[PDB]
């Protein structure tokens, strides 16, 4: 068995552009960072408050072959992405969320 961690991805608009605010299971603002100490999953739930019809399309990595995250799964409605982390390779990876929107055909990225 592993652990399952749950982060809410709140997206609001400020000065006409998206702002990503992560909340934890306590309702506290956080950075959306996770320390993994055994095999398990991380679940990100989208709360789109932008009116721009945001949907997750995946999770993007500049170093996708580093072995920190094993896999990404996505719900059919784009409201959830989950990461499988078997925590065999030690180290750190960074990623950005990738989203579609209904205002235009550009994909949306979290800044970090």
């Amino acid at each position: 068995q592993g652990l399952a961690q749950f982060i809410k991805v709140n997206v609001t608009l400020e000065n006409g552009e998206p702002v990503f605010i992560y909340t934890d299971a306590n309702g506290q603002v956080c950075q959306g960072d996770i320390t993994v100490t055994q095999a398990g999953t991380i679940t990100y739930l989208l709360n789109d408050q932008t009116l721009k019809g945001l949907k997750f399309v995946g999770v993007g990595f500049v170093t996708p072959f580093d072995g920190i995250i094993d896999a990404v799964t996505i719900s059919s409605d784009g409201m959830l992405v989950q990461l499988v982390d078997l925590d065999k390779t030690p180290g750190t990876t960074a990623f950005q969320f990738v989203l579609s929107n209904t205002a235009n055909t550009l994909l949306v990225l979290s800044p970090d």
Binding site: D33, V36, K88
Partner: peptide, 7 residues
């Protein structure tokens, strides 16, 4: 965000 793995 960042994931840190401690195995």
């Amino acid at each position: 965000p960042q994931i840190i793995n401690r195995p």
